Design a protein around this nucleic acid. Structure first.
Lengths: 61, 61
DNA sequence: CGCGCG
DNA sequence: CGCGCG
């Protein structure tokens, strides 16, 4: 499922970086890569985060 | 697979009608709804299209 | 190697 | 009912 609280933890982390990989987001939150990726991709649908067009690297809009 | 040619056709439809549903894009292009959605969701990852936060309706940023 | 998939 | 899933 989707945790809005997980969404907010990810957004807060991205707010401290200039682009980040899910593996490092997961490391820094103490979460699993799959959970972080599930949330990143869903947030990207409506524009809350954005992925590099070629690389698995994530940014705030 | 993902066709960049298909991406451009979908973007062109959206440029004509904001707030479109996949079924209507598919009808116009002569494609399957599932194919159109596969491309919409992948384009949403890097912000080329954007989904409505609550509905399967699509916008062009 | 991109993987998120329920 | 959101479904895109390979």
């Amino acid at each position: 499922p989707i945790s809005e609280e997980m969404n907010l933890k990810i957004l807060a982390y991205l707010g401290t970086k200039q682009g980040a990989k899910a593996v490092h987001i997961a490391q820094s939150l103490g979460a699993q890569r799959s959970e972080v990726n599930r949330h990143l991709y869903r947030m990207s649908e409506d524009g809350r985060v954005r992925k590099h067009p070629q690389h698995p690297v994530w940014y705030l809009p």
